Amino acid sequence: LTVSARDAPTKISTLAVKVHGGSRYATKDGVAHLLNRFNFQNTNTRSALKLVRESELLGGTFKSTLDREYITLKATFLKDDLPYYVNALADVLYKTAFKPHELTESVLPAARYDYAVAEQCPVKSAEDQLYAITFRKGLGNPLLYDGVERVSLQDIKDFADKVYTKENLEVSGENVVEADLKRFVDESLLSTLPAGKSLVSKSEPKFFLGEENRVRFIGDSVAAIGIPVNKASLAQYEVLANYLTSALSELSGLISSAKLDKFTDGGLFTLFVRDQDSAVVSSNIKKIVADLKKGKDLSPAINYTKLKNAVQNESVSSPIELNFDAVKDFKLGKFNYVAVGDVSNLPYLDEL
Amino acid sequence: LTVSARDAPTKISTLAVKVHGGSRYATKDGVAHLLNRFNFQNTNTRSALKLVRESELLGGTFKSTLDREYITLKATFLKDDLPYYVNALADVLYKTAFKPHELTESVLPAARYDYAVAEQCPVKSAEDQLYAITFRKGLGNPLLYDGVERVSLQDIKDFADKVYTKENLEVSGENVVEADLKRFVDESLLSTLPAGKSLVSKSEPKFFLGEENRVRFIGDSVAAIGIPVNKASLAQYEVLANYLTSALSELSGLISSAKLDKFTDGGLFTLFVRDQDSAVVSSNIKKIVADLKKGKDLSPAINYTKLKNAVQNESVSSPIELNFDAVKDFKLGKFNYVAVGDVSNLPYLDEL
Amino acid sequence: QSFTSIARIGDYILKSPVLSKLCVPVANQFINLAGYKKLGLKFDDLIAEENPIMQTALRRLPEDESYARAYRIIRAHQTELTHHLLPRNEWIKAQEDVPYLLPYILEAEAAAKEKDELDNIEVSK
Amino acid sequence: QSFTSIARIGDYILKSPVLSKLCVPVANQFINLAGYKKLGLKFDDLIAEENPIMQTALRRLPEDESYARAYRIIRAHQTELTHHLLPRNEWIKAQEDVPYLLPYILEAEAAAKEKDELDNIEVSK
Amino acid sequence: MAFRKSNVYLSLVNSYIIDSPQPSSINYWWNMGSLLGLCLVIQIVTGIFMAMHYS
Amino acid sequence: MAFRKSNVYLSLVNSYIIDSPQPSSINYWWNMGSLLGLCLVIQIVTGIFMAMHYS
Amino acid sequence: AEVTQLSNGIVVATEHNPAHTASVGVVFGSGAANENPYNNGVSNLWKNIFLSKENSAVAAKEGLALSSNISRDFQSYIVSSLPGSTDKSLDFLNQSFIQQKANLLSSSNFEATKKSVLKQVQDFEDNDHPNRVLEHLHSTAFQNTPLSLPTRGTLESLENLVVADLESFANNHFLNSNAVVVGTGNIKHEDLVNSIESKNLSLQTGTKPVLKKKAAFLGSEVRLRDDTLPKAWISLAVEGEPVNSPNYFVAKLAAQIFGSYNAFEPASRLQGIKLLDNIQEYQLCDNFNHFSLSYKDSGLWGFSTATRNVTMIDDLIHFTLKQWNRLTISVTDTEVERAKSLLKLQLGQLYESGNPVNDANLLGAEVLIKGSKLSLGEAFKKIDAITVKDVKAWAGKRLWDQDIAIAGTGQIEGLLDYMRIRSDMSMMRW
Ligand code: HEM
Ligand code: HEM
């Protein structure tokens, strides 16, 4: 029950309840998705309808996001209305109704559309494929529900039981008086939650290297590489990603995107080459794997990749900093590879 | 232009023009499928409609099948009508019209339905996955068209040009007088075809071992193994397949199917474990890989697997025989593996 | 008349043991004279369904009750058209004549009443 | 009257240089007096389309000709309703007034005629 | 489809009088409406023929 | 949907008289039909009022 | 919450709040509304060389990040620093807009940039149908008038653009009297204004831009029918309010009453919007959103929408316009009050994001037009003071029986004629 905050002379506050219940810890496939889609439905005292109608008149909205690790229940509002949104978020965590008809009429539709939006963007099909082959059953669990194994209303309830506990969440208010926030959290249903355990395991996730998958796809072709990083060797890969996505690198206009996904215990580096035809995708990645295999750096972005890693303001609550003014060199060891699209015209792992 | 035959005192003859133009040799994906679907459309002298109406009145039907290697144009009819079906098959090979509207109205629909039937049977999704990872670009080419790369009317025409040649086909009539058949083939448009080259390469196809793929699927779960075989070491795997699909093996009721696909230059052994839930699929294959790793045989089926390999009458035109009364022992080396279905509940390659 | 209102009046009678002992016997005898149980129907099968509340309610009915209502209704029409009643061993017994649709109806009426309330809320400063 | 029949008569005239030199000038002058080119139409745009042959034919028209026919027809209606003709530089020229739909029509008529022939074939033993 | 369905005039007849789905259990009390149409016809036909002779 | 569409009687009026898709280019020669309906009405109305006085 | 603007030789505007990074930039008082039909796209091209690989690598060495935005009334070039490097951003600004403003326009750089804004503007027209439609809305609404020119320029004026056109534009609009230097982030006013008054040298001071002719709304439509697209996308608007209109906020509130919608988001289906009762029964659209767009001379008030229900587009338009009728005659207290609260929330989320580059653009555009920025708390005072009577008087002037402007693309066969849409801008009365 870590209750953070930070005041300011502004007018918009934003409460936020982070909860360790993303796809990482998921008993059945997509159940974290369904639960995230179930937030802000009916509680036992307040209907989804009344919540919206009330918050609108006050001047604030709700929103529930899904990560590979976090389910975050956020609330954005006018400053002096704090207690209401604290108790609203409290209500949801403690006592959402989970009516069978809410499942069929609101949650399953909303999830089906989520899966559909993602089913048609081939970098996301790739990113999911990258996770599933590196970490074979941890962070490589499916992000979204697609119905490959049954998930009943009970499974969604059981999972809410595990994940919504005092030990497994952190309240976090931006633009809030810490005094009143802590005061309001302890005086609510938050402090009356069961506090089971947290599944933030310190042990490095076991990832398998030199893995590749090929998915046939009608649309744009995309070839992607993904590299497992260390708990400490991650801040160099961060400058790598920001180097590859900058005018310093000559091969920045040869890729679509490159990023490092930072977690609580390691991370994953991703690189995305995407274009219409398979010829331009083959070349632009065959070059990258050859150019980074004989890699370089010389800390050129060391202040720029510190600029970019700082302008992520929300981050603060931010991990390791001065690891940039440390290592500046980069090789390119073994990685993981996925070809999505015109597959009979894309590189295999052999020839990179 | 190998013209085989074999007479009999029966009433039904069956002409057949085998042609080396299956998915094995395919310039673009599914083009062999489209061409197979284009056979018996319009020629330049006879419409598809008239062909059917004429052959019906005579008493015979046509049919065009696709293999991983062969496109076979077969014709079944009453005996004394031989010349007609020889010239009909001749007409198709030499001068099908390939009208743009036949593509859009008859061929693409018929192919789309073909792909749809196959898209819903999870053993076939597996069998395709097995080929694609063993032989990465030869017999591992897609059998059916699915539109991942463009195929125009011209591509279908170009491919018909390569594949429909005197050197790349064999006429073969069951229940036919060889005298009249050879006489009718040489007196037709068959002998007036260009004779380019044949792509029946003697060199063993380069297959990669220890490969695995996992496809998520709503329906039955199926785990499959696939083993590359030698040009000479294939007749032992044949008894293996017939051993596993017989009452001699204790683990016959633990699998759905097992077979050896014999080609002109090697083969592929396949084993299919399929059931509703993922628990029964995990066990029944985890046992098989452990039971055959400490394998056996003692030639128990050596007359039975010779019975089964003989009752395939159509085969005759049959390869190696007395290779059964030779080797009777079997290990289980490295193979290839695919999990299709409830994937987060199926074995990885590690634990088999 | 809403089911929320029928429930209000009915529950008031059912609790107060003055009325409860006076009325329920009258009501029990009314239900037997009605005769719908001799056709194989439960009362809730009889509710007029051509309105949004009842369509919401029937939509939310679990599968197995839905198939059962369908059979009871079809069987009632067939018996009606033959001008018979069912064999007595096929009649609905009082233990079976449960308000199975009532909770779905009441739930939908409350949801509807709240929407009407919220669409028309006044504000005071 | 079928286009197969119009083509029969027309081609006979077009080949025999007696008729060809006699008629084509008459026909050329008829086409100019018709006036459809001043509205931006090609003759084949004028063919009545509410029958199966013409629907088959229009279905088989390549995309780019289809979009072009659509524009010419819409532009003709708009000009008609303003009681104007187009600017002369926008008129269809004789070089452009091609029978672009004719081959699709003739093809469909032949296919149809064969089906009618085959549905009605007699047999002799 | 059947001509009684495809024709513009007959389809009206078909949807009102031929294929019109009736509840299986309606009794003879539901016969009165057709009897009213019949009555309307009897009144109109006999009235017109009488009008021919009426001042 | 709009009431003119959803109502059983008004939708007839809507599909024949309000939303009915006309070719943009029909000229005044296509006005004669409405003039015929008008004529039919004039004949019927004036005839009934005269019938009241006719022997 | 600060607004410190003071004029030395140039005009300097800042707004500082201890955050993390600092953003410095120059914002010119001339945008696509200042171009011609024939050099349309020159500003977008300027933006794109300013962010070219050559200029962008020189900034990334120094640890600086580049940002630019082309609008209608204005234009902005922005560098974000790490906040002690507030001086090295001003170095990059001047090293570009005095020194390198003759080195950025090198033959090989220009041709590779022109080739990239051509693939860019083409991609827009081919695929971005909502913004494509909204851009054509401005095009027809304000035809033959400065606001009609699209911000990215047209493919035909773009491919016929040369280095001299960039030059001529830069020499007429990148002037001192048409400029404001803006700093947001955490850096003080006196921290920046001194680093500016450090170096003198005026550069083309005394030179004014070129005057023009005023923008005007013309009721009209452009219909970009395309039956191959899987949806219809439409935008429809009346003449709205310019910035520094008395009814600037009444208009923005009126748009919040009908708000925005997304059929697939459960929460969105539950909003206190009366229009949603009508459109959800047969699912008349996938989404809509109302807007009050304001510029220097004029604005557009209306809505945009997307739909797969291609046989009921006329019900979409009809129910939406009947709702708008209500603003003149029957809008309720609690609708107004709901809009106040939600207008504050969204205006807040705009003016105070955690991103100084947005703050710079909002500050820059404001001070260029009225010579000052109205504080967020000052806006809320104006918003809270709006009565039902105000909205009615506004709608009766701007909405009731007024001309509209329409644009659409995709399957819009079912979008009825102009006069049918235009008749629904009012109701029959006794
Ligand atoms: C719904 C239709 C009609 C009803 C209910 C109806 C009813 C009646 C009644 C009650 C009478 C007096 C009967 C009597 O003689 O005691 C009558 C008379 C008459 N009706 Fe009708 N009528 C109808 C339609 C018509 C029509 C369409 C005509 C056509 C001109 C018509 C022509 C006459 C004439 C000529 C008489 C006088 C002859 C007589 O007394 O029977 N009626 N009608
Ligand atoms: C399509 C409808 C009709 C047409 C074309 C029509 C035509 C005529 C014509 C040509 C005449 C003689 C006009 C003359 O006086 O020279 C006439 C007379 C008459 N009509 Fe009609 N008529 C129609 C409908 C009706 C109807 C429904 C009634 C209703 C009773 C009616 C009642 C009479 C009467 C009372 C006369 C004698 C008065 C007179 O001579 O004008 N008519 N009609």
Ligand SMILES: COc1c(O)c(C)c(C/C=C(\C)CC/C=C(\C)CC/C=C(/C)CC/C=C(\C)CC/C=C(\C)CCC=C(C)C)c(O)c1OC
């Ligand atoms: C869903 O429910 C239904 C249902 O829809 C129907 C249709 C029926 C069956 C009943 C019917 C179809 C009744 C239909 C009849 C009518 C609507 C009649 C309308 C009235 C008229 C008066 C007809 C018009 C007649 C005339 C103008 C008379 C013609 C005059 C002549 C020939 C004069 C001749 C004389 C001379 C001298 C020339 C049902 O039974 C039923 O439920 C069980």
Ligand SMILES: COc1c(O)c(C)c(C/C=C(\C)CC/C=C(\C)CC/C=C(/C)CC/C=C(\C)CC/C=C(\C)CCC=C(C)C)c(O)c1OC
């Ligand atoms: C696709 O094409 C169309 C199209 O469909 C339409 C509808 C129109 C517009 C035209 C029309 C809608 C014409 C419609 C009119 C009719 C069908 C009229 C039918 C005829 C009648 C005679 C009506 C019935 C009338 C009566 C019984 C008279 C009422 C008598 C009274 C009130 C007696 C009162 C007296 C006393 C004493 C009580 C077009 O113009 C058109 O193309 C451009």
